[PDB]
Structure 1
Amino acid sequence: SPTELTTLMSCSDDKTVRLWDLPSNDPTRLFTGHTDYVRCGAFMPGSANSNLLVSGSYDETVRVWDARAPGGAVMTFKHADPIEDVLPLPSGTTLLAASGNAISVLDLVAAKPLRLITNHQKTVTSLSLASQGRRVVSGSLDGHVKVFETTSWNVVAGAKYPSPILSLSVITAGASHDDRHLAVGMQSGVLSIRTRLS
């Protein structure tokens, strides 16, 4: 959890995500509701959303739970693709669910999907946030990396790697969090690091 230093979430494979407290030897809370593999998860950053989890399953469902009511999903969203990745925005309102050949920007303040964005040919694998929370970079199994603006969501820049890529993240150096260098891990098994200095 980005706020509490001793609380973590875990999406297993079976049907469950669960919140653990580090000193304890038992899950603090248990959350069900999915029906297939669940394989992406995130906390909700922001001040008001202190305890909200989002998880994307392979049952084409992105669910967001409150950690105060250990029942069902507070909100759910059903796509038509296996949902591989999820990131919230640092603003706390909108969310990106990367599922199949298209990512989907969804609103949580109105529980209504904003826009389906298709640009990739095999499935998209991993999203990451970039330069100042201002650009979402996406990495897809077509060996393709493509960075979008987040205001109007047009395909701003991109590049191609010699192998299908699986995980991707630009990482920051330090003060003011300028993106130091971007890493991409591909199927062939090599970590490609592209570095920029300033």
Structure 2
Amino acid sequence: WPISHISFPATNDLFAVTAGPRVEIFSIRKREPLKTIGRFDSEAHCGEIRPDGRVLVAGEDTGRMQVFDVGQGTRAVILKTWHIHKQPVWVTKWSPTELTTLMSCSDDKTVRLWDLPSNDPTRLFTGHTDYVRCGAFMPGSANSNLLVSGSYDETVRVWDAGAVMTFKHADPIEDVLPLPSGTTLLAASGNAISVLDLVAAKPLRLITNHQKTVTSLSLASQGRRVVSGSLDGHVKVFETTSWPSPILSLSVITAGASHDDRHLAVGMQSGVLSIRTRLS
């Protein structure tokens, strides 16, 4: 069974999307599946509970994005549902600024910005090629908050809310995250991860350690070191200034308790999930 996502808010719940309709909510205290949730149609894509309370969103195979609350018991009450675009939604992400503001990056050429309690997308964005998979949220301490979207075989982009500072492509993009500085970003393609100074829309500098294709990228323990994870079956940690799991990996992300990291969560296409509270 494949594994496609693992995330957590910004709480004793580490949420794990395995690619089927069942998706497991974890206690980070006792490492166990706290609730096997999920009544999805065919294929639940990348889902994450929101960073205040526990309201989970995840997208389905056809395009039905569902958002539903969850507590401490068996409460899978479908809060509301979405069936606007009929092509597989790949990631849905919250906004750490506004509690009712979502993000869907589909298998379309379009990504779009949501508000919860309405039944219409509050902002729509076009421009990519098809299957633009990944995307994220640019935080701002005093600046405005921008949006990132990396595509299948195309570029990676950022825009305000039209202001698209699209970068470049040389390889299929599948692992993107911005730093907590809100000015620098990581766009990671198959042979090579790429660190991106976003200050003056400055170009890349390119780094390779994984021989085969990278799949997921996670920032790590102190907020400083950054662990990258491949389809080679190998992950490794990176610095902030200079920059082993038994089979091939997909969505390998650490899990932190309050600020101290607690356990590396390791997803793989075979089905096991190497979570490790014991590190070096």
Report TM bin, short chain: 0.7 to 0.9
1:146-188: CA deviation from partner (whole Å, max 9, x where unpaired): 11001111xxxxxxxx767676778777775111000011111
**Alpha-carbon distance, 1:65 to partner:** 1.2
SS of residue matched to 2:185: strand
**Range 18-27 or range 43-52, more displaced:** 43-52
Distance in structure 2 (CA, Å) of the matches to 1:30 and 1:101? 32
Runs of 4+ in 1 over 4 A off after TM superposition: 162-176
Aligned partners of 1:83 and 1:97 also within 8 Å: yes
User: Does 2:157 match 1:63?
Assistant: yes
Distance in structure 2 (CA, Å) of the matches to 1:13 and 1:6? 23
Give the 3 Å change call, closer, same or farther, for CA 196–169 of structure 1 in structure 2.
farther
1:55-91: CA deviation from partner (whole Å, max 9, x where unpaired): 100132001011xxxx935201112111101100001
SS of residue matched to 1:38: coil
Query: Paired residue for 1:51?
Result: 145
Distance in structure 2 (CA, Å) of the matches to 1:169 and 1:84? 11
Aligned partners of 2:229 and 2:252 also within 8 Å: no
**Alpha-carbon distance, 1:5 to partner:** 0.6
Distance in structure 1 (CA, Å) of the matches to 2:165 and 2:248? 28
**Alpha-carbon distance, 1:48 to partner:** 3.2
Query: Paired residue for 1:163?
Result: 245
Mark the runs of 5 or more structure 2 residues left unpaired by the alignment.
1-94
Distance in structure 2 (CA, Å) of the matches to 1:82 and 1:172? 24
User: Does 2:164 match 1:74?
Assistant: yes
Aligned partners of 1:139 and 1:166 also within 8 Å: no
Give the 3 Å change call, closer, same or farther, for CA 114–145 of structure 1 in structure 2.
same
Relative to the length of structure 1, the TM-score reads 0.85
**Range 98-107 or range 43-52, more displaced:** 43-52
Aligned partners of 1:163 and 1:188 also within 8 Å: no
Distance in structure 2 (CA, Å) of the matches to 1:41 and 1:146? 22
Relative to the length of structure 2, the TM-score reads 0.61
Matched positions, count: 186
**Alpha-carbon distance, 1:100 to partner:** 1.4
Give the 3 Å change call, closer, same or farther, for CA 197–137 of structure 1 in structure 2.
closer
1:102-141: CA deviation from partner (whole Å, max 9, x where unpaired): 0101111111124100111111000001112101100000
**Alpha-carbon distance, 1:18 to partner:** 0.3
Mark the runs of 5 or more structure 1 residues left unpaired by the alignment.
154-161
**Alpha-carbon distance, 1:189 to partner:** 1.1
Distance in structure 1 (CA, Å) of the matches to 2:139 and 2:132? 21
**Alpha-carbon distance, 1:44 to partner:** 0.8
Give the 3 Å change call, closer, same or farther, for CA 40–173 of structure 1 in structure 2.
closer
SS of residue matched to 2:122: strand
Distance in structure 2 (CA, Å) of the matches to 1:164 and 1:73? 43
1:30-70: CA deviation from partner (whole Å, max 9, x where unpaired): 0111012111110012313442110100132001011xxxx
Give the 3 Å change call, closer, same or farther, for CA 166–97 of structure 1 in structure 2.
farther
**Range 44-53 or range 182-191, more displaced:** 44-53
Aligned partners of 2:115 and 2:121 also within 8 Å: yes
Distance in structure 1 (CA, Å) of the matches to 2:118 and 2:248? 34
Give the 3 Å change call, closer, same or farther, for CA 94–167 of structure 1 in structure 2.
farther
